[PDB]
Design a protein around this ligand. Structure first.
Ligand SMILES: Nc1nc2c(ncn2[C@@H]2O[C@H](COP(=O)(O)OP(=O)(O)O)[C@@H](O)[C@H]2O)c(=O)[nH]1
Ligand SMILES: Nc1nc2c(ncn2[C@@H]2O[C@H](COP(=O)(O)OP(=O)(O)O)[C@@H](O)[C@H]2O)c(=O)[nH]1
Ligand SMILES: [Zn+2]
Ligand SMILES: [Zn+2]
Lengths: 289, 289
């Protein structure tokens, strides 16, 4: 019964790709929403709690008829389209707050109702809660941000395209969220709301584009929602022979002209990881205040 | 305080490698035993329970002096050497039973005692509990077992060398454990104890070594601890043009001569995954009995 049913269900909606990360052919599910997730995302999902997400294996696990009925009632496109048609919806939600949301609680109930063969009413929940926060890691392309993100070893790197041209790489651990994108525009503001820290990555060896990076950092610091954000500058690629030193970059970026902002420049090499943890400890400590 | 201390501690013991999988430079720990684990293993470890394993990030997390004192008291080689000097020790333990063990409960307590600056007495625990079981996946080298193991998408593939020459690849989900090694000898018996199912993978296109595979399968079926194990034969690489059909392999292996044993031959292609789930469903259903 199970196999025939699951094989039939994955052919429907956008069930052939992971609901969270887009990874092809997910062999895991969250019965709770009838959604299909990859093995990596299934791990993140187990952490949410059995009440919030009931994770099962498509390969081998104990199945109940109600659980298969829930899979039929749910769906990847269904949950996506439902969430998108909600007041409380945030496309910048971290996994933790996406599942703590009222829009999630409603679909949980719709899935439960339709699996029981009941008619469901949208007309007939207090979400739980420093608090949920973002660490924005931006700079020009080729600065070494993906390298830094990977080196952190804090989790799975999730690529998202919320809009055309806009490529977002994101990592999550508990309430901390590291968001990465290239600079050099209105959807960015949504990410700024929770931003407590701004990491500006500069290629210390790219002498040509140093003024472009300075223009972009100033454009960022001019943002109203970023006012109280702590700034960490990673003067990266210090390993290179003709690279500018941290004292040179501090000048070329005009960091000493900044007032009413905790800032710190850190000379790093992202490929070796030298300076990455020292720069991060500073930020982590500033964020503790 | 935290950083200086952790940097100092990883230089000690075999802390530069993951305690479970051997992956280089682990950026996660289990404070509970003062052990260093990779991000993938940290996920498996979180699942064990906060009482059994308290998982923290070396990159960024909330640290207490006692937690750092626990890291000092514990260690990768310390926990390994302690476990190895115990009566209840099993090198074939699944993560779940390794941490449910009395030898684990004792080291938890030694770590707690020494971190508190107390003297510890080895002289001064009921482990919890179908039950814990193994699915043995063997065959000749190049049969396509690593391919099958990976395709299952049931978890992290963990390579272990319990003895010289003996290479073991293992995957775990809840109580089910998939153990893989090449055939073609006395440490094998330890793995047989929990074995409920035996998967014999044969390269359907290797006409030269088909009799070698038959000799090895019969050698296996002659094992006393494997008597009641259900046998699934994967006649793999059926995609190849000059491959032998399942009816040909059933004969060449002498499967119809077998009595008092549930057996099933499944024609598969591991690279595409065709037949892998159908063959597994049969086993999973037989194991339900
Ligand atoms: N020499 C050197 N190369 C680096 C460093 N960091 C990144 N790279 C290289 O810079 C390029 C851009 O890295 P990437 O992380 O993809 O930059 P991103 O576009 O900001 O994400 C890749 O070739 C990197 O390996 C570094 O610290 N030193
Ligand atoms: N054509 C084909 N090649 C396969 C199949 N399964 C495995 N292979 C290839 O067989 C070789 C051995 O695979 P591997 O899983 O490492 O075999 P193992 O030594 O039993 O672990 C690799 O080149 C595989 O990609 C299959 O079903 N069809
Ligand atoms: Zn995923
Ligand atoms: Zn590991």
């Amino acid at each position: 019964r199970t196999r025939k049913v699951l094989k039939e269900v994955r052919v429907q909606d956008e069930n052939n790709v992971c609901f969270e990360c887009g990874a092809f052919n997910p062999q895991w599910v969250s019965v709770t929403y009838g959604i299909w997730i990859c093995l990596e995302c299934s791990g993140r999902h187990r952490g949410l709690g059995v009440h919030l997400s009931f994770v099962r294996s498509v390969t081998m696990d104990k199945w109940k008829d109600i659980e298969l009925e829930k899979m039929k009632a749910g769906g990847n496109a269904k949950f996506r389209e439902f969430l998108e048609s909600q007041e409380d919806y945030d496309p910048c939600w971290s996994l933790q707050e996406k599942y703590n949301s009222r829009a999630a609680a409603l679909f949980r109930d719709k899935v439960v109702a339709l699996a029981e063969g009941r008619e469901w009413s949208l007309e007939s929940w207090t979400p739980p809660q420093k608090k949920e926060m973002r660490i924005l890691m931006v700079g020009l392309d080729a600065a070494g941000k993906t390298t830094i993100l990977y080196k952190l070893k804090l989790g799975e790197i999730v690529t998202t395209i919320p809009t055309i041209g806009f490529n977002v790489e994101t990592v999550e651990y508990k309430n901390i969220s590291f968001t990465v994108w290239d600079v050099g525009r209105p959807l960015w503001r949504h990410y700024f709301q929770n931003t407590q820290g701004l990491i500006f990555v500069v290629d210390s060896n790219d002498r040509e584009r140093v003024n472009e990076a300075r223009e972009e950092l100033m454009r960022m610091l001019a943002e109203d929602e970023l006012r109280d954000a702590v700034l960490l500058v990673f003067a990266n690629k210090q390993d290179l022979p003709n690279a500018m030193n941290a004292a040179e970059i501090t000048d070329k970026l005009g960091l000493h002209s900044l007032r009413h902002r905790n800032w710190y420049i850190q000379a790093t090499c992202a490929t070796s990881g030298d300076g990455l943890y020292e720069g991060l400890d500073w930020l982590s400590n500033q964020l503790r205040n």
